[PDB]
Amino acid sequence: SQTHVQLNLNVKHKLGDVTEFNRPKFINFHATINENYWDSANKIADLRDDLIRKYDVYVGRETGMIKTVLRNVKEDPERPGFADPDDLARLCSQNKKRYVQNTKVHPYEKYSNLILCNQFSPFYPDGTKTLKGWALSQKDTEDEPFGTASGEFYGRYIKEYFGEGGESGEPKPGFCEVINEPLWDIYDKPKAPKSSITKLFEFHSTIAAQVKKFNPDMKVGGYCTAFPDFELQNFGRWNARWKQFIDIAGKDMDFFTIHLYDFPCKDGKQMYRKGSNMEATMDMIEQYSMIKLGEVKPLMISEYSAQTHDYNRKPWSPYRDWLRLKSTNSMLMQFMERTDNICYAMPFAMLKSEWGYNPKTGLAHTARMLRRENEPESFTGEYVYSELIKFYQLWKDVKGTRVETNCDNPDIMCDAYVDGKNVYFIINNLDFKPVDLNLSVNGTSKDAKSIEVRHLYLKGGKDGVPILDVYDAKSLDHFTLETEATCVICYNFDRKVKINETMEEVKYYATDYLKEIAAGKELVFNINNVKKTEYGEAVIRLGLGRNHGLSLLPELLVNGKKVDIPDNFRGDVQKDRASFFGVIEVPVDYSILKGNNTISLKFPDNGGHVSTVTMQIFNFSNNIRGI
Ligand SMILES: [Ca+2]
Ligand SMILES: [Ca+2]
Ligand SMILES: [Ca+2]
């Protein structure tokens, strides 16, 4: 076959309160406006003007400055294991004054909404000494619960260092994550001590309270999961970690935070989160949050992209950047589908990291926006853009009101945004081969005045180069989207595009989750208080975590009526992964749904779990399909 992709530019796609592309939320990177790196060693004279203003790119996230203050602050004489309030204020006040004097950056504050976070040590109270020769208190009583001193430091740090902008000081962070990737240091890294997981989650509650004692309106979140791999140990990992975190600390967090990395080359193997896998990870967090807390917590993805194991001890290459680009684009498309429940998604790329270069090995930082002119041959010359800039060039100008798009291949993701006379049409390929697309654009009488095509793909296969092919077109009824590629098609119209209909997406959750599968035994899920309109469509989302060999085509009954499951689902079959974990998206005849709904699953074999059953309802303002 060939793939049909349809854009209905007169139909607004509403999800919760969101109807627009949020550039600050999505088009950003892991940096700050006041990094030293901006103003020296670069081929471009005013790099902030080029990267931040011209491309319209937002920031950021920063752990270094708070780490430095913590490691050099005097111990409290009146209390052992606590930072001294007067010296903390002193050091924080030195930094503030330096920010106050740094007037070149004050006009860039409007591009900045800081995610603040602590690196694991010395902040976690495990006894690790600071450079001043003392550890943070490891007490755990009802009067001084675990992390009280850590929390007081964090709380004080925020109150003392930050101002309101410009000559009053650096603006307060929009978000304060508790601690970076804590279970990686605690339990999973080689030679990890395996201290209490439970105590890490209590730690979060105690940090939040301490932070709010000094800054009552500051948002706090956790636990900043390095590797959210819920299906492991037959869902024991879920049970021991995210489940317990939600039970213990969920109610005290203003937001939840995780990291999501694809593994496109780990010992020659390809293990992806892009596609059905990350959908299952995110559905599970939301569904259990609904069951236990009665709400979906806003989700932050403070780092995402690919981790490139096989290339991480290699010099920089365009190819290594490509591996990151393809993961970033697909993940961003998936985050955009949940925009109402994502507060922030940040691709992991730093500006430069001149100090992350190791002179012994000759290895530069593996995710940089800028690299030296003579890399890979030598680490010399002035800094120029890496290939990672291609993401920000690809997404340039994209903004406006979201409009409905659909596609008959679940390995092809699409979306679109309308800004006055311009329309941005974004298409992403999850499949590992080229896909020939037929494009239809409906809802306008008049043809576009011009068309610009941006196509980001890999030339030359393995160890090749990414290309960003930008060209003008008078017509584009067909288009070949390359392997794992993305295109952004910008239509320019003579008159303002008229949006006169609305498709409202609403996501419904089940009463229960996480059910063992036994052959021949019905698993029944209940989704209630569903609101329908005369015209609509719907999708049922089956979260399945099963060993390979086991069936991903159960008999499905919705309110006693039979619904077919398609062969093809979103993304890959997960061959190199240890087991299958993913959401199979099932279209369902809208006429079958009602207020309370019975979803019944029967598999022919034993083992594994149905992690979640959720449902997307799409309610139309009119008969937009013409049925
Ligand atoms: Ca996990
Ligand atoms: Ca759609
Ligand atoms: Ca597929």
Author numbering: 20 to 646
Wording from the paper:
determined the three-dimensional structures of these four agarases. initiated by GH86 or GH16B, which generates NAOS. depolymerized by GH86, and systematically saccharified by the exo-acting GH117B and GH2C enzymes. exo-acting β-d-galactosidases, while GH117A and GH117B are α-1,3-L-neoagarooligosaccharide hydrolases.
BpGH86A (pdb entry: 4AW731) as a molecular replacement model. (α/β)8 barrel with two Ig-like domains. GH16B and GH86 were examined in further detail. differences between the subsite architecture of both enzymes.
